[PDB]
Design an enzyme around this catalytic site. Sequence first.
Site, PDB file in Angstrom:
ATOM      1  N   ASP A 253       0.815  -1.201   0.000  1.00 16.56           N
ATOM      2  CA  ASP A 253       0.000   0.000   0.000  1.00 16.56           C
ATOM      3  C   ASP A 253       0.861   1.269   0.000  1.00 16.56           C
ATOM      4  OD1 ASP A 253       0.711  -0.876   2.672  1.00 16.56           O
ATOM      5  OD2 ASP A 253      -0.290   1.011   3.313  1.00 16.56           O
ATOM      6  N   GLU A 254       0.330   2.305  -0.641  1.00  9.76           N
ATOM      7  CA  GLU A 254       0.834   3.662  -0.502  1.00  9.76           C
ATOM      8  C   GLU A 254       2.333   3.748  -0.761  1.00  9.76           C
ATOM      9  OE1 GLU A 254      -0.773   4.378   3.430  1.00  9.76           O
ATOM     10  OE2 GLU A 254      -2.572   5.365   2.620  1.00  9.76           O
TER      11      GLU A 254
HETATM   12  C1  LIG Z   1      -3.493   0.040   3.799  1.00  6.18           C
HETATM   13  C2  LIG Z   1      -3.690   1.228   4.710  1.00  6.18           C
HETATM   14  O1  LIG Z   1      -4.632   1.268   5.436  1.00  6.18           O
HETATM   15  N1  LIG Z   1      -2.773   2.213   4.656  1.00  6.18           N
HETATM   16  C3  LIG Z   1      -2.840   3.397   5.512  1.00  6.18           C
HETATM   17  C4  LIG Z   1      -2.456   2.991   6.908  1.00  6.18           C
HETATM   18  O2  LIG Z   1      -1.013   2.833   6.974  1.00  6.18           O
HETATM   19  C5  LIG Z   1      -2.843   3.991   7.939  1.00  6.18           C
HETATM   20  O3  LIG Z   1      -2.461   3.523   9.229  1.00  6.18           O
HETATM   21  C6  LIG Z   1      -4.351   4.097   7.796  1.00  6.18           C
HETATM   22  C7  LIG Z   1      -5.045   4.868   8.872  1.00  6.18           C
HETATM   23  O4  LIG Z   1      -6.441   4.753   8.729  1.00  6.18           O
HETATM   24  O5  LIG Z   1      -4.628   4.780   6.546  1.00  6.18           O
HETATM   25  C8  LIG Z   1      -4.208   4.093   5.373  1.00  6.18           C
HETATM   26  O6  LIG Z   1      -4.097   5.059   4.407  1.00  6.18           O
END
Ligand SMILES: CC(=O)N[C@@H]1[C@@H](O)[C@H](O)[C@@H](CO)O[C@H]1O
Length: 499
Positions: free
Chosen positions: A306-307
């Site tokens: 992710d990201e």
């Molecule tokens: C796969 C995923 O969830 N990635 C991020 C995560 O690292 C973060 O802790 C979360 C908080 O809601 O927000 C998401 O953007």
Amino acid sequence: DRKAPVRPTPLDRVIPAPASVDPGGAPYRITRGTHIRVDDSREARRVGDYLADLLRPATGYRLPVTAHGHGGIRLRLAGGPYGDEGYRLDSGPAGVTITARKAAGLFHGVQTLRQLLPPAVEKDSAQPGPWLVAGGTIEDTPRYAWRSAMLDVSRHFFGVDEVKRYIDRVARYKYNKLHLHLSDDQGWRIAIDSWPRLATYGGSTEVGGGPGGYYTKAEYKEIVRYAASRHLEVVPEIDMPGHTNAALASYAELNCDGVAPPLYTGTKVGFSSLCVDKDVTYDFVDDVIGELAALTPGRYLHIGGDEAHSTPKADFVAFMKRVQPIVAKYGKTVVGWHQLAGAEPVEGALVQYWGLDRTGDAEKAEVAEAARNGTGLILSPADRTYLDMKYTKDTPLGLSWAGYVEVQRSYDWDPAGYLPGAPADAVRGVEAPLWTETLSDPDQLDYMAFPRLPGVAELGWSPASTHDWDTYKVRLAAQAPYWEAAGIDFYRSPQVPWT
Ligand SMILES: CC(=O)N[C@@H]1[C@@H](O)[C@H](O)[C@@H](CO)O[C@H]1O
């Protein structure tokens, strides 16, 4: 009489909703002489001992576990149409019998039994009861085999005992997988022998600064053992190639410019990347995955994905083409976040979909297409089952980037018809992730996990025919005196008519 009702809770008033509930007859009452009768096997005794431990403090009863005689609570392994995880629970004046094919099914029946008993069962000192179990028969099997909870121990570290506590929270609702997010930008949480600074340096802080922490191999093995005794398969995650600052901070050579970034204590995402163009990157990944696989008796290894917003798309694709086979090399099945669907999942892979109602059609389509190509789908939408998301704008912890997620929203959907165009048979199940940017102690985890955690478990377990907010919320409301007696903080949602 909330705390010690005159009459037993209805046979059907449990979460997850059981597949079949046939109430009838008089209840069983546990009394001081009740024995727990098990089969003459170590694994049967293990479930009996677990049950006895749950009941001894509040009853003050001896509750011996033995393999002889006609005990009033009987746990028995037998053929039957219950699968690997299902059970039958029979209750009446002659006793309670939980029948299953496997220990995990007996364990699940125990989780039902503890909700049929009254809330006083949660107390740590002897109580008057009465210890009643509604009469009738329950036959119960799961809809999905992937019923998972995630704990983020990277953003704030939680030690072995705090993880065991969270394990016991989720075990109540028949989750069978525990996803541990062991590395991110603010922390590396598993000791790797070939790269010892990952833990001693990359583990040395967390969000907000100050001490962090990490698991030795022995500690991780103990988490796995304890989870296994609660019939949770541990799914570890080392997120790559993004969310990697803790590793990058630990070893200058892993970075594109050869300079270690400082340790990170903020809450931004998307800014870190492994260096896709350097050979040492893949030595590192192979070392870490190999050491982690050796500690992981479960089938799955989660590589995140992710990201990776500092990783150009073509590099991300090339990175994933190279590292996915490392997982099969060490005998495991790849899991990644659904960004992996854009980077050619290998055969057998699963992807974890964390999109939202508002996610664009093109992104949803890429995931549905991987489902058509045989990739299994784990559904954890960020505007449904992200337990770190605020309930409303006034929630004092958690995040709001996905909007607000009240209890009904979290529950009121159908995994089988959720992702447009995705074949229902590609859906392996659901996950409730708990991210910890804002949560630094176990009580705060409880307040954000409860009361949505049981609802996601029901989505994983119960038949679609049992799904209904107006009747579910009554079963949920009934948990309040249990949680109160157990010391479990929870958000008293106005949508729920709390008992
Ligand atoms: C796969 C995923 O969830 N990635 C991020 C995560 O690292 C973060 O802790 C979360 C908080 O809601 O927000 C998401 O953007």
